[PDB]
Design a protein around this nucleic acid. Structure first.
Lengths: 56, 113, 209, 120, 122
RNA sequence: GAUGUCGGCUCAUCACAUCCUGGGGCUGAAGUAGGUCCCAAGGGUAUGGCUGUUCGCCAUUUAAAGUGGUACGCGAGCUGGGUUUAGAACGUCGUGAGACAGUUCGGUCCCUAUCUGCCGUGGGCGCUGGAGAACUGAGGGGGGCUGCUCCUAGUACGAGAGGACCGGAGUGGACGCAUCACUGGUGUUCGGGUUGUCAUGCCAAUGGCACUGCCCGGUAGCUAAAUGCGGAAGAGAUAAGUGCUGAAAGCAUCUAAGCACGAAACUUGCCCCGAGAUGAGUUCUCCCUGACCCUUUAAGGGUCCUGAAGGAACGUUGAAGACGACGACGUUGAUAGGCCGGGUGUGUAAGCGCAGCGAUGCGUUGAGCUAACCGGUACUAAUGAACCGUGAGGCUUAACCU
RNA sequence: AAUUCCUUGUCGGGUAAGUUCCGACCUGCACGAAUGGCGUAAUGAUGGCCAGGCUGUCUCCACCCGAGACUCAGUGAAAUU
RNA sequence: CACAGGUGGUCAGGUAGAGAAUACCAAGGCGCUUGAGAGAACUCGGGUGAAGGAACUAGGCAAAAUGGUGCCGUAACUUC
């Protein structure tokens, strides 16, 4: 199986309509340090539910 | 839960406990369309599947030089009485190997207890 | 007369007085309540909307909560509509019991069958598996030919190949009911019904002789 | 097609799965803190928490059965003495999982797993 | 079950010892034969002094099934060896005078009393 | 300038010049069963030996094992069995190389789907304020097969043999849908037996490898060979056919008017999808009731506040699932994991002491373990939140309310 | 017949049923005696046939174990047009 | 090509095994330059399957089955 005619750029960009990435909006707000983090995830310094979880 | 609720009241409380590999007699109710009579079955039990109301046991009989295997339901009303004369001594839940070896060379032992 | 709506919890055999085993299906039915009654003047047809079971208040949102409060009925798992029999009349809010199936002796069960996902041609349409030897290469369960040569030049609609099975309404007709319990709210129907354990089932009177 | 079926495959056969479950569980009980993927830790729970429950009761038969797992004498020695009394008054839920984002090498879901208190 | 090209034994003293089930009667696209059925068999080896010879084709009635017989109460009747009774082509009458081996009760249901009567067992 | 040919496997579709089932006419149609002709394509329409065979002969069933088209259907679906490039041999022709619609052996079947087509599942938008539900149905799709027995009735017919029409009730084969209640299979996540070897220091006891090292069983789920149901009855209009009255044509005539029957043929009636049915349908419920400024002064634009119902996202997950999507739950919780009890499976765990030099057995013990199954248990994980989604919804006409 | 178009030559065996095979006849288009005729033990990854065990080749496919196929992260072709 | 291909000679341990075969280890060397999720259709390599056992197919193709030692015993033909 191989092409018979060259698809146009319209077809290429028309196929890529559903390939757009989705962006997060409301990740989280920490109640102790007030830094953004993923939902149900620890922060950069290992903070979750206010109390330290990793102890470095 | 709900299934069990229908399970318990259909149980028969006079079911004997028999070890696998024992000589078991089964009395069954056979109907000719007008009269009900008792039929006797002599054999050794080879497999027991006791799971709720669906409890079943397989018994093998060597009759007229031919082996016959029949199963029963421990809670069905078709059976009348279950009796055990000789208790076998086999350390296996299933006795399926009895089919291959001949009966004369497959004499079972008694648990002596 | 109308049927009921219930949930399947399992199925078990039943022993008769003569020893014959009758495998029946155990379906629990809750006391349904009429939520709406339809008439010719407003909707152009007569039907009654009923609900079964209970639903948590937090999960219930304002629209259906107000709909239930209009009829004076509490929350329910779901809503279904049953057509009347040209003379049978129901009122809003009355409970529906189960003993009314003491004379139909034949019921029809509809429900969502078990989902098998994307099934192959052999499993879907009961096709014939090709030979696995005699030189066969990379073609065992493939459908094979799906049409003729260029004279038609296309594949006809409704052709049989792989697809998604289950997760759809399935109707089984002429099912015999054995026993019905009012104090326990259980129904025993001979045979097998579609769907898995815990799935919602709709039982209706048999329409055929 | 997975109707009421449990047990992840982890792209491994039974022998490799059992071996790496055993190694992971030994490492966890030795260190009390492990960072791994979410499915790996989730399947680790079903191996470690029953192991802790077995270790709750100390006996020669129980110790031998525990040694049949993790294939380590030191691991069993740490058990029945340290995690026993700590989890004696606890009925399940000995392990917890804390998600920590994704790796920069293959973009796999990362999560830390640890005990209840860890005595720290 | 019993189907075409099946090695079968004998439950009667007609003279045959092993018979070959090669055709099953009952209708179009008949796949299997139960415990009581009419099948077409060919003799594969028989006693030279018996009532039948080698190569004869005649109708047979199944007596025992290896798979078993489904009772109305969820009971199966297994057997060790599958046999048949030799019957005449034109008339459904047994050829042998005696039946050796167990016989199921289902043969009585479909009006086969000749085998049941002269059977020293069930 | 190229694998592309015949046959076989899978998959079928259409026509009726109909093989059966269905409705009839005539008959050299006593009946059953037969011959011919008409209508009718809804359904069904075989298994093996020989040969590669299509076709055929043979053996055995059925109602039959229909005739043809679709590149003598279908090789970017499979087979390479015939013929057949390169080898060789047999018989014939030719002095010969070689040839032979003469015969035998062996002899590479590629392609990751771009488009239309088909099967399923999703995202955006619209249906004119938004949102959550439940339904009517314009349309489309799935099935429409029948053998045998009994009663009628050994009745009608028939000298006897033979043997009815119609109707009713059961029991079979194939097909389709559903289920795991039983029977089994699988069940490399459960237990046990056993060989070789290595390791835990050693005895015992375990673990790895040797196809799961080789076997025996077996939880749940899946599955059929297992069991439940269906092929309707009926209604309307008809083909052939049978008719009533009835003139043209004083008779006659199924037709010129009118009326009444009439088939598995058509539409309903059985099941499923179905308002993208843009002709965008119907019903119920819920929510939103501020201010100011500017321009070209109108379905105008701009600013502050407000963010409702609901939706979206994340986590636990599923008898839902390729991904999407669907379903249940998120502290006001049994959603998943762990634990307890119970059940099931395997089978008498380790250790102790005794008997036996030893292997081994014995009481502890139907003990130990037990995955996916059942009932409970917040012990753990499902954070307080935040994002989208608004501020009463155009014009004209018609009926009422002032 | 490795040779026969008539041919599936005629008969028998094998099979319920055998255009294959074997055994008898020669009507040898177009076998034939060193471009060798007949037989021949053993042998042959040689052609054909039959029998016994064995099995998913099939009736009739079902389940399970892994690698791809599906999603995510990174790198990233092709014939054809 | 940092390629599942080929390349001559020497060293030749333990266990069980007739054996340089085979299975596990000693010293020694590696886990094979993309990983993580779920376990659809379908493909490839396998395990098992109730009943029949070649009925499928051109054809027992592929599969499946036997497989060793010691003892007894072993046909037609024949160049013995």
């Amino acid at each position: 199986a191989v092409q018979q005619n060259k698809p146009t750029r319209s077809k290429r960009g028309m196929r890529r309509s559903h390939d757009a990435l989705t962006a997060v909006t409301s990740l989280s707000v920490d109640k102790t340090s007030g830094e953004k983090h993923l939902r149900h995830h620890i922060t950069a310094d290992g903070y979750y539910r206010g109390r330290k979880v990793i102890a470095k | 839960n709900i299934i069990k609720q229908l399970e318990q009241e259909q149980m028969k409380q006079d079911v004997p406990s028999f070890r696998p590999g024992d000589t078991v007699e089964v009395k069954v109710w056979v109907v000719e369309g007008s009269k009900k009579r008792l039929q006797a079955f002599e054999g050794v039990v080879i497999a027991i599947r006791n799971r709720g109301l669906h409890s079943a046991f397989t018994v093998r009989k060597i009759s007229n030089g031919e082996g016959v295997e029949r199963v029963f339901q421990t809670h069905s009303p078709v059976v009348d009485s279950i009796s055990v004369k000789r208790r076998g001594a086999v350390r296996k839940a299933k006795l399926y190997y009895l089919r291959e070896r001949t009966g004369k060379a497959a004499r079972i032992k008694e648990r002596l207890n | 007369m109308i049927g009921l709506v219930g949930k399947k919890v399992g199925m078990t055999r039943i022993f008769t007085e003569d020893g014959v085993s009758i495998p029946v299906t155990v379906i629990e039915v809750e006391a349904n309540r009429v939520t709406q009654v339809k008439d010719l003047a407003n909707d152009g047809y007569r039907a009654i909307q009923v609900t079964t079971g209970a639903k948590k208040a937090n999960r219930v949102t304002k629209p259906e909560a107000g709909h239930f409060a209009k009829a004076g009925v509490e929350a329910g798992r779901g809503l279904w509509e049953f057509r009347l029999a040209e003379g049978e009349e129901f009122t809003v809010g009355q409970s529906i019991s189960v003993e009314l199936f003491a004379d139909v002796k034949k019921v029809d069960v509809t429900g969502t069958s078990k989902g098998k996902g994307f099934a192959g041609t052999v499993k879907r349409w009961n096709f014939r598996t090709q030979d696995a030897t005699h030189g066969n290469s990379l073609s065992h369960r493939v459908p094979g030919s799906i049409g003729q040569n260029q004279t038609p030049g296309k594949v006809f609609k409704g052709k049989k190949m792989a697809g998604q099975m289950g997760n759809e309404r399935v109707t089984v007709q002429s099912l015999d009911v054995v026993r019905v319990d009012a104090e326990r709210n259980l129904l025993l129907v001979k045979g097998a019904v579609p769907g898995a354990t815990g799935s919602d089932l709709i039982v209706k009177p048999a329409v055929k002789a | 097609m997975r109707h009421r079926k449990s047990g992840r495959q982890l792209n491994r056969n039974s022998s490799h799965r059992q071996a790496m479950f055993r190694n992971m569980a030994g490492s966890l009980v030795r260190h009390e803190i492990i960072k791994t993927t979410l499915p790996k830790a989730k399947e680790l729970r079903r191996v470690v928490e029953p192991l802790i429950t077995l270790a709750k009761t100390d006996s020669v038969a129980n110790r031998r059965l525990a040694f049949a797992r993790t294939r380590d004498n030191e691991i069993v020695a740490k058990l029945f003495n340290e995690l026993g009394p700590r989890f004696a008054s606890r009925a399940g839920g000995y392990t917890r999982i804390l998600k920590c984002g994704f790796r920069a090498g293959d973009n796999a879901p990362m999560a830390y797993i640890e005990l209840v208190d860890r005595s720290e | 079950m019993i189907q075409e090209q099946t090695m079968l034994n004998v439950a009667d003293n007609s003279g045959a010892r092993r018979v070959m089930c090669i055709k099953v009667l009952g209708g179009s696209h008949r796949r299997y034969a139960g415990v009581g059925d009419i099948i077409k068999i060919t003799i594969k080896e028989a006693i030279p002094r018996g009532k039948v010879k080698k190569g004869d084709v005649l109708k047979a009635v199944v007596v025992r099934t290896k798979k078993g017989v489904r009772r109305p109460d969820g009971s199966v009747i297994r057997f060790d060896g599958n046999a048949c009774v030799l019957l005449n082509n034109n008339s459904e009458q047994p050829i042998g005078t005696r039946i050796f081996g167990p016989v199921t009760r289902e043969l009585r249901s479909e009006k086969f009393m000749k085998i049941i009567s002269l059977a020293p067992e069930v």
